[PDB]
Amino acid sequence: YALLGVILGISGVIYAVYLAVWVLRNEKMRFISQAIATGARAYLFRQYRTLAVLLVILAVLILVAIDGLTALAFIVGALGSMLAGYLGMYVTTRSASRVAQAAATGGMGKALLVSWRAGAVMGLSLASIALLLISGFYLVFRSVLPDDWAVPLVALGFGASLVTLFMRVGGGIYTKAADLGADLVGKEDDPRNPGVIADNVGDNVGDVAGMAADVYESYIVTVTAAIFLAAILGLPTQFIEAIILFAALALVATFAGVNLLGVKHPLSSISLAIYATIGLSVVLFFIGAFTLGLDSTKALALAATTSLGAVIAPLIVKITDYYTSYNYGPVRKIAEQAKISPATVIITGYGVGLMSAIPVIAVIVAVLGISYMIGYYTVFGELSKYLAGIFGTAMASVGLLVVAGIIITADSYGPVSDNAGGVVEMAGLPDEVREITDVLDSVGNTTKATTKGYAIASAALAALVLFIALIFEIVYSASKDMISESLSGLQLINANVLIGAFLGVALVYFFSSRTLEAVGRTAMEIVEEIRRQFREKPGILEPDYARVVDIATRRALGEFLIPGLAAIVLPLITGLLLGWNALAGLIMGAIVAGVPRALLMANAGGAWDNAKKYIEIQGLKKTEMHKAAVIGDTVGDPMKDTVGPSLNPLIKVLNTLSVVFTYVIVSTNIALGIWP
Amino acid sequence: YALLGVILGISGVIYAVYLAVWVLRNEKMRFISQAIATGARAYLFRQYRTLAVLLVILAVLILVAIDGLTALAFIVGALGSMLAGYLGMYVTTRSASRVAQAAATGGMGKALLVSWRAGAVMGLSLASIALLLISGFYLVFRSVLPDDWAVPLVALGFGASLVTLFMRVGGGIYTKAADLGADLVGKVEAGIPEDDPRNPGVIADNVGDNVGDVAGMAADVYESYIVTVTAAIFLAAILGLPTQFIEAIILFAALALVATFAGVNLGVKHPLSSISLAIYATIGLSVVLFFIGAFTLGLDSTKALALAATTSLGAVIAPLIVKITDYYTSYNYGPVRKIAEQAKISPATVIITGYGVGLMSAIPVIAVIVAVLGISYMIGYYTVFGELSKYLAGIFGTAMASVGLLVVAGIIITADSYGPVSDNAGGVVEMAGLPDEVREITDVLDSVGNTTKATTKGYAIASAALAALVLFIALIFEIVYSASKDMISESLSGLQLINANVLIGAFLGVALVYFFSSRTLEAVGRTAMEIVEEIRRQFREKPGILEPDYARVVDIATRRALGEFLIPGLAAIVLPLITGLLLGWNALAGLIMGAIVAGVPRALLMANAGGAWDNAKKYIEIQGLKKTEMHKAAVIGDTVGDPMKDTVGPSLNPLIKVLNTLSVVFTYVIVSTNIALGIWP
Ligand SMILES: [Mg+2]
Ligand SMILES: [Mg+2]
Ligand SMILES: [Mg+2]
Ligand SMILES: [Mg+2]
Ligand SMILES: [Mg+2]
Ligand SMILES: [Mg+2]
Ligand SMILES: [Mg+2]
Ligand SMILES: [Mg+2]
Ligand SMILES: [Mg+2]
Ligand SMILES: [Mg+2]
């Protein structure tokens, strides 16, 4: 069913129009909702503009680097994600006023389903775009250039990661640089300062756009890495045709996931995502045995491996939901610490962030470990079996992210409720209706953390699969064998490998701490900019929002190239100056440190944010107790949405440039495996 | 010259009495100095009491586990460090009042040398105790039981690490649980500056100061001096190199004791004198080591200089970390003012950016420890049975480097007692309302000490990073000995980084450290709350205006802190054991990998930021010197990085280091449970 990948995929626009026309179904509410669009307009118009500049130049560079041709698949790969991004962005800006007007007089359900449908637009679209764009080029290359046709479409992944890197560090900086600069100049969502629109425009850039594009990396890298695996091993094409079927059902499981046909409490979100998976699993178990014929133990192995990747997601949902929701303790543990002081709640609110990372880690290892076994016992040398093992882990990581559609649907429901939460406080809407937007926002805050777990954890499984894929790229370049030398050259105790593991964990500090000082300083350029305008005339009686948008992006994107390119070079220099061993260690320590830390922060930031919401509804005042809880908010605030989610686009892309330069780096090493 | 290692060592305690009697050379000033002693008394009396309980029980267990005998060296090994601790404890309690009275009327020099002399007591003694304690049992075991006599004396390291674990997690908790409980009750209920006499937390804090950096840190570094000499000597023995190397290293260490005996001698102006002496206390050691090294031992000119070059790389890195942390930690330098100025905005903004300058302060240390062992790896590889026989000459070149780095520990611990002793004086002056100017100079000695304690965390942790790979190779030969009753062919191809259990372990190793630190953070944060409540019950009874009570606050904090200690302490012992047996030795090899990969960068990330927030407070606390919205922000950052500075940062290092020390003890016990050479179940 290779051709079928396009059939159901193109229905994304078919179904995105349904939800788009669903959202398209006040004076002050319209201007602010329209302001989010104009702000997001100048953002994307300027973000895609410079984005295409570097894409075409590098697409021209990749065209000569491949010389068949691959820059063509390189280009559309990036265009696919951005297309689903522009589709979901125009929805979020309009939802801010839609869900606000719907919730106030309709009830809690009206808000939950409206803000949820606005998110189903992006989730189902992007997932649809990913499947059809690879299945389209997969079938084209399948018949076009035999003998490793899957590799050409794999460059579609690299070009698509370059753009997710763009908005994660760019949108991540902008999302928090505005949230930070707007919050403290007020000391929230007060109309006096223009930072309220720059923040909410950031909300759609941090979690709606920046995060949704990030997970696009998960859906594209594993399908290209998993297909690339089954090819390089020499296994039958039965494996490659089954994975495309599992993916299509995930689109079917996410097409059904978003129906949500009586809403009561915000638990409805977790239940649907929970059963949107089982509906996929058993439908996958059953459709898997239908299209392909394999020995019963081997065919279920595919259904069992992907079932392990799909199940882990609801588990991370229930975990982060526990450590993040104010309904549950670990949030009240720190919110109560507000009575003492901010420093004391900081350290202990930091603490419960650490212990919130180990449960996710405990699952991702046990989950891929079981998939490794089942895939190893079911499906030329001792490695040929071991490779069947790491492939069992590839199937797991693939199964995890193929259901990405349902999770991104939630990363747009959270911020859209954040937008609604802003619309009500600045427009001074009724107390009750402006409070429910906050709980929808606090539930959304539990969602963004859940997706960061879903995003980062899925990356951890791919790294070891990308490791093996990187090897076959250094084996191919070595011949122009290596298996006998690299195996005994990359044992963890080798000189380059251990140093790299320290430079990989040291590089991530230099990358994240460079981002933190940048976002913190560019925000100061927003804080300074506000004074420039507010000093001229009084903010009582009101371009101005477009100014804060354009100034913050070009200053944020300006810094982006510094760490973004610095994170590109330092691995390259170590990869060539020391060797591929050094980068293998650099990518090891990075994946080993990045996955736990980003969880430590992704969860803690959400906890401090939800901790404020819990006391901001009870306290709901400027009390020395609440003032302390706000300090914890803005600390974990940018570290939550800027550096936390950036380790994932670093780790995954960190193996994505090394594999493209294995031919370029191995020839520079002038040796098979070196420690000098 | 193996016997000489003991001769000069015992002269350290002989010489330590000179400075101890030198420091021993007012009414309100006398009671507080004696109160620190009674507090340190009830602390050590209760710490050594339970410390001997588990030591004897396990010493009896180790006696049957070895069945020659090795529990004897197990006992004295731990006793050596504690002896240098009790010598420095009685010194620090007396220095609080001594240095205060000396600085006020003599000048800045009088204070700088007195608080420094009080530290030379601990530094020179402990380093002396370490050298004589190993050369003593080394020479005894060299002639007692040939054929792997070095292994029995290696058990001296584990037993000594078990207790350094005691005070790092225990003293670390106590130091910040008291520092925390005393600080916040002054701002929330009392409304007074820290180190104020009204609340009993002022004595509990300063008593903690001597336990966090003076005792907890100095005892921790004893782990560095003991583990590498046993691991490096164990390497040269197991590697098959000539005994010429084993006799030379004992001389280099003695030279370091001579280079540190001269280091403490110390015209005075700015606290830069500390960095200059510690910088030149190394070169004086290096060239003196270069010179005495060629005299006693004969080796090929290129091969003999290799020893002087390898250890010279371990010795030079320390002053480099000193100048690095001194830059990121001292208010004299930028990165501190970067955040102190952010106090004008808000605490959250200075928190995030004060956190930032902590991260980039970790990459310079990492950049050096890798370059240093890499060059030693090369020089040791090209100078000194299979492809491994040459490669092992490399990691041993790294062992010599790690050995060379920590043999100069004496000069650094001398500084870990100068920092808090100035903190003690800093407290003595503000509560006794001593002259403004002289109580301000104690603060600069306190802020300079803050520049010292962070430097030692770098010095402590970095030396551990080089030893880890040495401990990896040493643990391998312990599983090779148990496997035969070959492994080279199986483990090499069984522990390549992509193995199933190894990668899982690397995630469980970095995950376990979170479970250990966040369990420690919640404990110290909650047990401190047991101190805050304790103050109220006593302060509620009678007014704190007009003053047993100090002995209670000491006794209550220890039994509650030590009570929690067993939870992470034993949990950190088990979880590696479970992974080592449930999954295999591959899993623990990965668990110890991810731990060293996260611990070395993490502990630096925190040790430096915590020190920066404290020094950031100091710069604005003298200019502002008031309760200003600007100063309040710098205090919030202080107490955040405050416990993360002295509890989690310095406890990760004794976790990783002890993790390779317990796993090597179970190589015989864990490999038989795995029921396979290398498996990924
Ligand atoms: Mg906010
Ligand atoms: Mg927001
Ligand atoms: Mg908001
Ligand atoms: Mg929020
Ligand atoms: Mg926020
Ligand atoms: Mg303090
Ligand atoms: Mg202190
Ligand atoms: Mg103090
Ligand atoms: Mg201090
Ligand atoms: Mg302190």
Name every chain B residue with its beta carbon within 8 A of the beta carbon of A502: 366, 369-370, 465, 597, 600-601
Three-class secondary structure of residue A279 per DSSP: helix
Q: Whole-angstrom Cα distance, residue B555 to residue B528?
A: 13
DSSP string covering A437-506: HHHHHHHHHHHHHHHHHHHHHHHHHHHHHHHHHHHHHHHHHHH--HHHHHHTT-BTTSHHHHHHHHHHHH
Q: What angle do CA B133, B136, B140 make, to 5 degrees?
A: 140
What phi, psi does A491 have (nearest 5°)? -60, 140
3-state secondary structure string, B505-542?
A: HHHHHHHHHHHHHHHHHHHHHHHHHHHHHHHHHHHCCC
Distance CA A205, CA A174 (A): 8
Residue B493 DSSP symbol:
T
How many angstroms separate the CA of residue B503 from the nearest CA in chain A? 8
**Hunting for tokens 């540190």 — which residue is that?**
B260
Give burial (CB, 10 Å; 0-12/13-18/19+) of A382.
exposed
Pair of tokens at residue A216: 């696009």
Q: Note whether B495 contacts A499, CB cutoff 8 Å.
A: no
Alpha-carbon span B344 to B630, nearest angstrom: 5
Task: Compute CA A357 distance to the chain's CA centroid, rounded to the nearest angstrom.
Answer: 17
Using N-to-C axis directions, what is the helix angle for A108-144 and A150-186, rounded to 10°? 150
Distance, in Å, from the CA atom of B95 to the CA atom of B185, rounded to the nearest integer, reads 27
Tokens of B190: 């009392």
CA atoms within 13 A on the CB side of A289: 14
CA pair distance A124, A130, nearest whole angstrom? 10
On whether the CB atoms of residues A368 and A398 are closer than 8 A, the answer is no
A464: which chain B residues are within 8 Å (Cβ-Cβ)? 498, 503
Partner B contacted by A574 (CB < 8 A): no
Is A362–B518 a contact, with Cβ atoms under 8 angstroms apart?
A: no
Q: Residue B664: helix, strand or coil by DSSP? A: coil
Q: Which residue from B440, B584, B441, B431 is spatially nearest to B501, judged by alpha carbons?
A: B584
Considering only residues 270 to 289 of chain B, which have any Cβ-Cβ distance to chain A shorter than 8 Å?
none
- Six token digits for residue B320: 């480099």
Residue type, A277: T
8 A C-beta contact, residue A230 and residue A239: yes
Q: What residues form DSSP beta bridges with B496?
A: A491
Residue A3: closest CA among A143, A166, A111, A123: A143
* DSSP summary character for residue B268: -
Q: How does DSSP classify residue B386?
A: -
Please name the residue of chain B whose CA is at the shortest distance from the CA of residue A497.
B497
Taking alpha carbons only, the member of B513, B643, B516 closest to residue B567 is B516
**With a CB-CB cutoff of 8 Å, which residues 584-623 of chain B face chain A?**
589-590, 593-594, 597-598, 600-601, 605
- What is the spatial distance between Cα A297 and Cα A282, in angstroms, rounded to a whole number? 16
Say whether B147 sits in a helix, a strand or coil.
coil
User: How close A551 gets to chain B, by Cα (Å)?
Assistant: 21
d(CA B648, CA B445): 24
Q: Is B213 annotated among the ligand-binding residues?
A: no
Say how far apart CA A407 and CA A450 lie, in whole Å: 8
Question: Is A147 annotated to bind ligand?
Answer: no
- B446 in a labelled binding site: no
Dihedral angle, C-alpha B119, B122, B128, B134, nearest 10 °: -140
Length of chain B: 681
Q: Tokens in use for B285?
A: 């050691």
Inter-residue contact B285 to B408 (CB < 8 Å):
yes
| Sign of the CA dihedral with A514 first, then A517, A522, and A523 last | positive
Ion ligand 10, residues whose Cβ is below 5 A away: B 179, 642
Residue B380 and residue B302 in contact, taking contact as beta carbons nearer than 8 Å: no
Query: Alpha-carbon Rg of chain A, whole angstroms?
Result: 24
Distance in angstroms (rounded) separating the CA atoms of residues B23 and B87 = 13
Give the tokens for residue B110. 């009088």
CA of B458 to the centre of ligand 9 (A): 16
- CA nearest B351 in A: which residue? A635
CA distances from A198 to A39, A43, A182, A638 (A): 8, 11, 8, 15
Q: How far apart are CA B375 and CA B311, in angstroms?
A: 11
- Torsions phi, psi of A430, nearest 5? -50, 145
Answer yes or no: are the C-beta atoms of B255 and B289 closer than 8 Å: yes
CA atoms of B624 and A318, how far apart (whole Å): 48
Report H helices in A325-430: 329-336, 342-354, 357-378, 382-401, 404-426
H/E stretch holding B429: helix B409-431
Q: How far from chain centre, in Å, is Cα B580?
A: 27
Angle at B196 between CA B191 and CA B201, to 5 degrees: 95
> How far is the C-alpha of B126 from the C-alpha of B130, rounded, in Å?
6
Answer yes or no: is B326 a known binding residue: no
Structural contact between residues B32 and B97, judged by C-beta atoms closer than 8 angstroms:
yes
Buried b (16+ CB within 10 A) or exposed e, A272-308: bbbebbebbbebbbebbbeebebeeeebbbbbbbbbb
List, in sequence order, every residue forming a beta bridge with A491; answer none if it has no partner: B496
Q: Which two tokens stand for residue B349?
A: 């903004």
Distance of alpha carbon A595 from its chain centroid, rounded?
13
* Residue of B515, B19, B444, B453 whose CA lies nearest to B221: B453
Alpha-carbon span A499 to B85, nearest angstrom: 35
Q: Which of B89, B93, B98, B91 is nearest to B26 (CA)?
A: B98
Burial annotation A469-487 (CB, 10 A radius, 16+ → b, else e): bbbbbbbbbbeeebeeebb
* Cβ neighbour number for residue B220 with a 10 Å cutoff: 31
Contacts of A564 (CB under 8 A, 6+ apart): A165, A166, A169
Q: Which of B349, B366, B512 sits opposite A506 (nearest CB)?
A: B366
Taking a contact as any Cβ pair under 8 Å apart, which residues of chain A between 328 and 367 contact chain B? Answer: 340-344, 346-348, 350-355, 357-358, 361-362, 364-365
**Residue A203: closest CA among A629, A554, A609, A612:** A609
Secondary structure (DSSP) of B273-298: HHHHHHHHHHHHHHHHHHHHHHHH--
A415 φ, ψ (degrees, to nearest 5): -70, -35
Residues 6+ apart with CB under 8 A from A535: none
Domain map (residue ranges) of chain A? 4-669
Indicate the residue of B503, B522, B601 with minimum beta-carbon distance to A348: B522
H/E/C letters for each residue in A529-574?
HHHHHHCCCCCCCCCHHHHHHHHHHHHHHHHHHHHHHHHHHHHHHH
How crowded is residue A264: how many other Cβ atoms within 10 Å of its Cβ?
9
A260 exposure class (CB count in 10 Å sphere: 0-12, 13-18, 19+): middle
Q: Whose structure tokens read 């060379």?
A: B404
CA–CA distance, A285 with A288 (Å, rounded to integer): 5
**SS3 for B410?**
helix
The closest of B444, B440, B446, B450 to B424, measured between CA atoms, is B446
DSSP letter assigned to residue B215: I
Query: CA–CA separation, B419 vs B417, rounded Å?
Result: 6
Whether residues B492 and A488 touch (CB distance < 8 A) is answered with yes
Residues 612-671 of B with CB under 8 A from A: 635-640, 642-644
Inter-chain CB proximity A639 and B355 less than 8 Å: yes
Residue B610, φ and ψ in degrees, nearest 5: -55, -45
Q: Which two tokens stand for residue A480?
A: 């122009």
On whether A640 is known to bind a ligand per the annotation, the reply is yes
Residue B234's CB is within 10 A of a number of other CB atoms, namely: 26
- Torsional class of A12: left (φ above 0), alpha (ψ -120 to 50), beta (otherwise): alpha
Can you tell me the distance from the alpha carbon of A272 to that of A270, in angstroms, rounded to the nearest whole number? Answer: 6
Residues of A in contact with B473 (CB under 8 A): 493
> Helix B150-185 crosses helix B649-663 at what angle (to 10 degrees)?
160
The span from the CA of B540 to the CA of B538, in Å, is: 5
Find, among B412, B455, B411, the residue nearest to B612 by Cα.
Answer: B455
* Secondary structure of residue B543 in the 3-state scheme: coil
Judge: A584–B493 Cβ closer than 8 Å, yes or no: no
Is A387 within 8 Å of chain B by CB? Answer: no
**Hey, what amino acid is at B228?**
T
Q: How far is CA A542 from CA A31, A181, A194, B273, B328, in A?
A: 12, 20, 10, 60, 45
Using CA atoms, how far apart are residues A72 and A62, in angstroms rounded to an integer? 9
Judging contacts by C-beta atoms under 8 Å, the chain B residues touching residue A589 are 597
**Separation between Cα atoms, residue A464 and residue A640, nearest integer Å:** 26
As a dihedral over the C-alpha atoms of residue A30, residue A33, residue A36, residue A40, rounded to 10 degrees, the angle is -100
Kindly give the distance from the C-alpha atom of residue A206 to the centroid of ligand 4, in angstroms, as a whole number. Answer: 12
The pair phi, psi for residue B496, each rounded to 5°, is -60, 140
- Is the minimum CB–CB distance between A323 and chain B shorter than 8 Å? no
**Closest by alpha carbon to A394, among A214, A602, A235?**
A235
* Cα distance between residue A83 and residue A78, in whole Å: 9
Question: Any chain A CB within 8 A of the CB of B369?
Answer: yes
CA distance B149 to B172: 35
CB B482 within 8 A of CB B671: yes
Distance CA A435, CA A412 (A): 19
**What is the Cα–Cα distance from A515 to A537, expressed in whole angstroms?**
34
Which residues are CB-contacts of A477 (< 8 A; sequence separation ≥ 6)?
A662, A663, A666, A667
User: Contact A576/A669 with Cβ under 8 angstroms?
Assistant: yes
Number of Cβ pairs < 8 A linking chain A and chain B: 218
- Using alpha carbons only, what angle is made at residue B511 by residues B505 and B515, rounded to the nearest 5 degrees? 135
Joined tokens for residue B159: 């037993």
Nearest to B429 by CA among B111, B52, B21: B111
Question: Which two three-digit tokens encode residue A267?
Answer: 């638990």
- For B206-216, letters b (16+ CB in 10 Å) and e give bbbbbbbbbbb
The three-class DSSP label of residue B496 is: strand
Q: Which residues of B touch A365 (CB under 8 A)?
A: 504, 507-508
End-to-end, the C-alpha distance of chain B in Å comes to 50
Contact B413, B217 (CB under 8 A): yes
Is B495 close to A495, i.e. CB distance below 8 A?
no
B205, B195 Cβ separation under 8 angstroms: yes
Among B210, B214, B206, CA closest to B183:
B206
Q: For Cα atoms A595, A601, A602, give the angle at the middle one, nearest 5 degrees.
A: 80
- Chain A touched by B503 (CB under 8 Å): yes
Which of B300, B322, B305 minimizes the C-alpha distance to B405?
B322
Identify whether the C-beta of residue A600 lies closer than 8 Å to the C-beta of residue A143.
no
CB nearest A464 (choices: B353, B356, B503): B503
Scan residues 447-476 of B and list those with Cβ closer than 8 Å to A: 465, 469, 472-473
SS3 sequence of B155-202: HHHHHHHHHHHHHHHHHHHHHHHHHHHHHHHHHHHHCCCCCCCCCCHH
Tokens for A641? 């949405």
List the single residue in A with minimal CA-CA distance to B378.
Answer: A676
C-alpha of A203 from chain center: 14
Please identify which residue in the block is written with the tokens 């225990």: B170
Return the residue in A377, A509, A511 with the most chain B beta carbons within 10 A, the one to mutate for interface testing. Answer: A509
- The answer to whether residues B273 and B136 touch, using CB atoms and an 8 Å cutoff, is no
Resolution of this deposited model, Å: 3.8
CB neighbour burial string for B23-35, b if at least 16 within 10 angstroms, e if fewer: beeeeebeebbeb
Q: Name the residue with tokens 């979690």.
A: A207
φ, ψ of residue A417 in degrees (nearest 5): -70, -30
Which structure tokens are listed for B178?
């008291």
- Distant-in-sequence, close-in-space partners of B126: CB < 8 Å, separation ≥ 6: B81, B84, B85, B88, B218, B219, B221, B222, B225, B409, B410, B413
What token pair was written down for B18? 């000179």
Q: How far apart are CA A37 and CA A43, in angstroms?
A: 10
Say if residues A632 and A612 touch (Cβ distance below 8 Å): yes
Phi-psi label, residue B626: left if phi above 0, alpha if psi -120 to 50, beta otherwise: beta
CB contact A546 to B (< 8 Å): no
Is the separation of the CB atoms in A245 and A1 below 8 Å? yes
Q: Which two tokens stand for residue B339?
A: 């955040």
